[PDB]
Design a protein. Structure first.
Lengths: 129, 11
């Protein structure tokens, strides 16, 4: 019954499109949903297979923005739940036509040290070969 | 529908 409340996340994530108008607005509000950061990754992930190649690339930006909206490494715990399927989600973007753009967010996580290299090995498996 | 730049948000 109460589990229907989680649909407040999945219906809005499915409504997202390739624009900062939809990304920055929902990623800012998603930080107030930190009370369920464990399931938010499950909603956003299953929309990648639903979406087109350029569209699922845009949905992948949401995860990167939500990690960085929690910000300042004060806890940044959103990164830990995204790490559960971070490479598995990248398996939906093996096409070099999109892998080149998903490397944009993975490049930032690598330079911003948002993840240990041991995790990035799975990111580069899923984006490269 | 301006698409954003991943480095724009701070961390």
């Amino acid at each position: 019954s109460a589990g229907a409340l989680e649909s407040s996340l999945d219906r809005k994530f499915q409504s997202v499109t390739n624009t900062m108008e939809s990304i920055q607005g929902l990623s800012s509000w998603c930080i107030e949903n930190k009370k369920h950061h464990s399931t938010i990754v499950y909603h956003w992930m299953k929309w990648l297979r639903r979406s087109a190649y350029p569209h699922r690339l845009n949905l992948f930006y949401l995860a990167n923005d939500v990690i960085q909206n929690c910000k300042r490494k004060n806890a940044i715990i959103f990164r830990e739940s995204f790490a559960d399927v971070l490479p598995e989600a990248a398996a939906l973007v093996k096409d070099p036509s999109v892998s080149k753009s998903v490397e944009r967010i993975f490049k930032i996580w690598e330079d911003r040290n948002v993840y240990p290299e041991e995790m990035i090995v799975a990111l580069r498996e899923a984006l490269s070969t | 529908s301006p698409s954003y730049s991943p480095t724009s948000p701070s961390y």
